[PDB]
Design brief:
2 copies of one chain form a homodimer. Helix content of chain A is 71%, strand content 3%. Chain A has 137 residues and is mainly alpha-helical. The complex binds the ligand CC1(C)S[C@@H]2[C@H](NC(=O)[C@H](N)c3ccccc3)C(=O)N2[C@H]1C(=O)O (2 copies). Chain B: GO terms for molecular function: DNA binding; DNA-binding transcription factor activity.
C-alpha cells in the first residue's frame, strides 16, 4: 500500500542508474553532461522555457541557465521564446532510443503483449491523473 | 512496436519526478535543503552508505556527492559511514506523509488486482534492470 511508493522510487532509481551508464559514451561524444542530456531528453517531449524546465526539474535556476545556453552554443537546442531541439540534437535522441530499445526489448522478449496492454492502461490513467494534479497551484 | 512503450515509461517517470519535485518544494524549503540534498536523505531512509556508494548508485560527480554530504552534516540530518538522525528521520516521515496521501487518493479507486499486476510487471523489469546493471 506504500512500498509501492517505495518500489517506485527504487524502480526509478534503478532505471536512472542503468540509463546513465548506458548513455555514458553517447554523451561524452557530444561533450554533454547527464542533465544537459536529460533536458535534451526532457525536451524531446515539448518546447520549454528555462523557467518551465527549472520547475519541472526541481533545482537551481542558475544551473538550468547554463546547461541550457551550453546547448545553444553547441547547436543542440534552439529558439522560437520557446526552446526546441536542433537536428544535431535529434540525432542524439535517435541514438538514445536506438540504445534504450535494444536492451529494453531483451528484458521484454517474453512478455504477454496483452498482459502489458492492461498494465499500460493503468499507468496511463495514473499518468493522466498525475499531469492533471500537477497543474493545480 | 516496442518503442511506444518506452516513450511512455520515460514520460510516466518524468511526470513522477515533476510531481514529487513540485510537492516537496516547500518542505525542502521548510527544512532548508535542495532536492539534491533531499535525494541523499531518501537513499538513507532505506539504509546507510559511505561516499563511493552514494557516489555510485546516483553515480554523479565524485566531488558533487561529497560537497552536498558535508552540508547535510551541518544541518544534522546525517550522522557519520553516513546515516540519518532524529531530525533526519523526521523529515522523511513528513516526506512520506505527502507522497502516500496523494498516490493513495490518486489510486484509491483501482482494483486491488489491477494494481498488483502492475507492481509485478514492474518488479520483474526492475529485477532484470538490476541484473543487467550488475554486469557493469
Ligand atoms: C540520457 C539520460 C540520462 S537524460 C534523462 C534523465 N537523466 C537525468 O540525469 C535527469 N536529469 C535526472 C535523473 C535523476 C534524478 C533527477 C534528474 C533520465 O532519467 N535520463 C536519461 C534519458 O535520456 O532517458
Ligand atoms: C562554470 C560554468 C558551470 S558557468 C560558466 C558559463 N555559463 C553560464 O551559464 C554562466 N557562468 C552563468 C550564468 C548564470 C548562472 C550561472 C552561470 C560557462 O561557459 N560556464 C560553465 C563552465 O565553465 O563549465
Amino acid at each position: 500500500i506504500e512500498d509501492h511508493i517505495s518500489f517506485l522510487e527504487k524502480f526509478i532509481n534503478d532505471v536512472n542508474t542503468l540509463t546513465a551508464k548506458l548513455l555514458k559514451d553517447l554523451q561524452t561524444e557530444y561533450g554533454i553532461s547527464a542533465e544537459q542530456s536529460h533536458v535534451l531528453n526532457m525536451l524531446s517531449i515539448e518546447a520549454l522555457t528555462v523557467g518551465q524546465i527549472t520547475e519541472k526539474q526541481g533545482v537551481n535556476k542558475a544551473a538550468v541557465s547554463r546547461r541550457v545556453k551550453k546547448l545553444l552554443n553547441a547547436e543542440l537546442v534552439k529558439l522560437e521564446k520557446i526552446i526546441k531541439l536542433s537536428n544535431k540534437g535529434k540525432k542524439y535522441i535517435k541514438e538514445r532510443k536506438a540504445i534504450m530499445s535494444h536492451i529494453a526489448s531483451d528484458m521484454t522478449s517474453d512478455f504477454d503483449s496483452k498482459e502489458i496492454e492492461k498494465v499500460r492502461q493503468v499507468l496511463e490513467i495514473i499518468d493522466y491523473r498525475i499531469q492533471s494534479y500537477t497543474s493545480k497551484l
